[PDB]
DNA sequence: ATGTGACTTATAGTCCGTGTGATTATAGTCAACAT
DNA sequence: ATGTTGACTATAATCACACGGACTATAAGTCACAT
């Protein structure tokens, strides 16, 4: 599938667990379905920037902070 | 509209220019539609990550450079 | 404790008595433990439907007759 | 498995739909797990009088009218 | 060249439900001794 | 006869998650016509 997606997918989960959230909490605060949060983490779904933005707000994290961890995950071995 | 969306778009336009590309050529290079691109640059589109990825390929810019730039752009 | 659970227990005891049964006999007839039965009637047990069902069979009473009674008891 | 159980589980669903509720509303209002409401209807499951009571409160229905519909369902052919 | 508009078609995102391993609270069942 | 106190062990009930189908909103991709 897509390189960037699974990275975006990975980072959303990583943060979520770092903050001791559950998918239920997250989909809560992101005002998306808990099915969608699952869908994203599970099968790296192809979300929209707007949806990503909602998730960032849900993770109680900033644009910047997210993208900084995104860059880190991309760079890894 | 969205704050992020506008700066993604701004960034896309910034890079296209710093490189000296036309929209026509960014569309060709990324195998997407020119009106599609025009839309994004006037910020009338809400890309998916996949699309963004294709535009990065077209701009010939790695994900990292794009995001390094987007961050800087984000901080006024 | 619970209102319903109390009325259920009361009903179980009521029917046992109008039939002149002992607890010992109610437990023999439904193959459950006598201390188990005791416990319900002193309202110290929160039984499951399955258990309730075994007790109805031990009381020789249909589900319907039981609930008809339980409703009436519920209404003071 | 159990005669009465599938009757109880049938009636919980009947009411739930009659009141235009979804499972996960009822799971909230009944102050029980999401998956328990499913599990009760889905298969049958052997609930407790206390849990049944919670569900009745959740269906926004009285002990009495629940049991009245229970009786009616038992009596069917 | 770029910017519209408007018009399909793919798919992102929603909504309601099923099914499941793992853990925790508690009912199910049965001792010993009471009265 | 019934009551009560511990117990052990089955299972009710919880919690975090995956997975599917069907439906709705909207992004993806392509026309025509501006400039």
TrEMBL record, chains A, D:
Cited InterPro entries: Cro/C1-type_HTH (IPR001387), Lambda_DNA-bd_dom_sf (IPR010982), TransReg_Diox_bact_type (IPR050807)
A family per Pfam: HTH_3
One GO term describing the cellular component: cytosol
Keywords assigned by UniProt, alphabetized: DNA-binding, Plasmid, Transcription, Transcription regulation
KW DNA repair (keyword) present: no
SMART domains: HTH_XRE
MF term (GO), any: DNA binding
Annotated ranges, domain HTH cro/C1-type: 12-67
PANTHER family associated with the record: HTH-TYPE TRANSCRIPTIONAL REGULATOR (PTHR46797), HTH-TYPE TRANSCRIPTIONAL REGULATOR SUTR (PTHR46797:SF23)
Name under which the protein is recorded: Regulatory protein
Species, as recorded: Enterobacter sp. RFL1396
């Amino acid at each position: 599938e897509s390189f960037l997606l699974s990275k975006v997918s990975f980072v959303i989960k990583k943060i979520r667990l770092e903050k001791g959230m559950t998918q239920e909490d997250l989909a809560y605060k992101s005002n998306l379905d808990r099915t969608y949060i699952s869908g994203i983490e599970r099968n790296s779904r192809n979300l929209t920037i707007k949806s990503l933005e909602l998730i960032m707000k849900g993770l109680e994290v900033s644009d910047v902070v997210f993208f900084e961890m995104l860059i880190k995950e991309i760079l890894k071995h």
